Every structure is written in structure tokens, then in C-alpha cells.
Amino acid sequence: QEHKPKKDDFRNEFDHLLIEQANHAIEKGEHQLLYLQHQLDELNENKSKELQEKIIRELDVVCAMIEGAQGALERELKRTDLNILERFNYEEAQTLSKILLKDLKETEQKVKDIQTQ
Hints:
Elements: H1 18-46, H2 49-77, H3 84-113
Helix pairs in contact: 1-2, 1-3, 2-3
Organism: Blomia tropicalis (Mite)
Subunit structure: May exist as homodimer and homotrimer.
Coiled coil: 1-96
């Protein structure tokens, strides 16, 4: 297996491009979900009241800002666009965002399902 470092090189989003904000949004969200998965698995059995209440708060604010941002941004870019490159980027953008969205939702549900103090 090849495990290499992956850090956003283009942080400065001055241009504030549509795809730029979208990619950054889906990237951050996805990452958080991947890392959150672990806590969810451990919390599933641990059933820790503190760990749960915490994950819920973090997952709430994350899924919230992501849902709102993604929805708005997506609705913005969806306004008008037609091109090979634009189509490709747009396709992958919605693909990654959609995936992270489903996973995130599932995680939240599970957390809420687990009974704790």
C-alpha cells in the first residue's frame, strides 16, 4: 500500500471559483466523515454518553454548514453551465458531495440511535 501525505495546496480561494468552493466543501466534509467513522464504530459499542453528545454536536455543525453550503453552491453553479471541462468537474463535484452526504446522514442516524445517559 502507498500512503502519502495529502494536504490542500491551493488554500487561498481569492478567486472564489464555483468549483473551487465546491471541491473544498466536499473535501473537508468527506475527510471529517472518514475520521468520524472511527468514533462512530467505537461509540456504537462504547455507548459513551459524553462521546455521543460530543460527536452529535460536531457532526451537527458539520453536516449543517455542509448541507447549507453545498445546497446553495450547487444551486448556484447549477444555474447555467455547459462545457467539457465544466461537465467533468461538475459531475465529480456532485458525485463526491453526494457520497459524503449519504455517509454523513447514516453516521448521524446511528449516533442518534445509540441510547446513552
